[PDB]
Amino acid sequence: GPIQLWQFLLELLTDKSCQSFISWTGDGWEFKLSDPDEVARRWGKRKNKPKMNYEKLSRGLRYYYDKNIIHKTAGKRYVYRFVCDLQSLLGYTPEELHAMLDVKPDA
Amino acid sequence: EVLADHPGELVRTDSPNFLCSVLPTHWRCNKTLPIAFKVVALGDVPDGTLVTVMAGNDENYSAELRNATAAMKNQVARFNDLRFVGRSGRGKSFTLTITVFTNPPQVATYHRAIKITVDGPREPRPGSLSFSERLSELEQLR
DNA sequence: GGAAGCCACATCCTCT
DNA sequence: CAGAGGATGTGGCTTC
């Protein structure tokens, strides 16, 4: 059915199998898109928009800045952070989640 | 009536002393108007006199506008990029109230002036569950 | 039964 | 390009 971008990313980030093109940095709810093109490809495939690329997917993320859902991490290419309360929404502390996903600290 | 830059650009208000731009019957909210909304004064109104516009109807006693205030200059108050943020309701339009801040103040109205919508004029068309389960519920919320 | 509304993007653009 | 935001068109869905 209907899916929002932040929710899609959230699906990928909770699937160990996707950690090669998208993953958690290790600092709270921050995450990095190591392969933007791949993420855009799947996003395009999910929404049925063949011509979808990162250039456009990023515009969607920028719409969240004002809505306090996702913020950009300054200076770090392809790095954003969920700024909404994912703990209340999912019931897991950044660590518990990181554990279940076997997250290794990023820097 | 025919003291406007172009044909059918101005219309009369419920008051004999003022005229204002003709507004699109339906427009998209937060979108710049096709023409610059003006309020023309027939009588003598000093340069600098403020003019405001309020939109409203049964749905919205008052609707959020942007740039709804302009200064009168040479009998004309030219709003720069006036916009409508608040919607008017399905199949409904806003009445505009023009207040010209002379002393005493003067009110002019433009009834059923414009309908505002999000699209605007448009071309015809125990127990514990997992993440997948949690995410799915979250994706349906609304 | 649909035209008319809402919503969340999708597309396109601007600059260094 | 990456990346902030404005301007508009697009499609899925819902509501009088």
Helix (H, G, I), strand (E, B) or coil at A6: helix
Q: Which residues of A60-83 are buried (b: 16+ CB within 10 A; e: fewer)?
A: bbeebeeeebbbeeeeeebbbbbb
Q: In this structure, what are the phi and psi dihedrals at residue B80, rounded to the nearest 5 degrees?
A: -95, 105
Helix B131-140 to helix A5-12 angle (10° resolution) is: 180
Nearest chain B Cα distance for residue A10, angstroms:
8
3-state helix, strand, coil in chain B (%, to 5): 5, 35, 55
Give the architecture-level CATH label for domain A1-107: Orthogonal Bundle (1.10)
Q: Which domains are delineated in chain B?
A: 1-126 (2.60.40.720)
Q: Do B113 and B24 contact (CB within 8 A), yes or no?
A: no
Quick one: which of A17, A78, A9, A77 has its CA closest to A43?
A: A9
| Closest residue, CA to C1' of D2 | A77
Q: Which nucleotides of D are covered by protein (CB under 7 A)?
A: 1-13, 16
CA of A60 to C1' of D11 (A): 16
DSSP A27-93: STTEEE-SSHHHHHHHHHHHHT-TT--HHHHHHHHHHHHHTTSEEE-TTSTTEEEE-S-HHHHH---
Helix (H, G, I), strand (E, B) or coil at B53: strand
Show residues of chain B in contact with A101, CB under 8 Å: none
CB contact under 8 A, B134 and A1: no
Residue in chain A lying closest to B139 (CA): A3
Resolution stated for this PDB structure, in Å? 2.3
Chain B from 98 to 137: CB within 8 A of any A CB: 131-132, 134-135
Calculate Rg over the CA atoms of chain B: 21
What residues have CB less than 8 Å from B94, skipping those under 6 apart? Answer: B55, B56, B57, B60, B63, B84, B88, B113, B114, B115, B116
Q: Where are the beta strands (DSSP E) in B9-86?
A: 10-12, 18-21, 26-28, 38-41, 50-56, 65-66, 69-73, 76-78, 83-84
CB contact under 8 A, A4 and B139: yes
- Residue B22 tokens, joined: 């003709």
CA of B8 to C1' of D10 (A): 33
Three-state secondary structure readout of A65-80: HHCCCEEECCCCCCEE
Q: How was this structure determined?
A: X-ray
Helix (H, G, I), strand (E, B) or coil at A101: coil
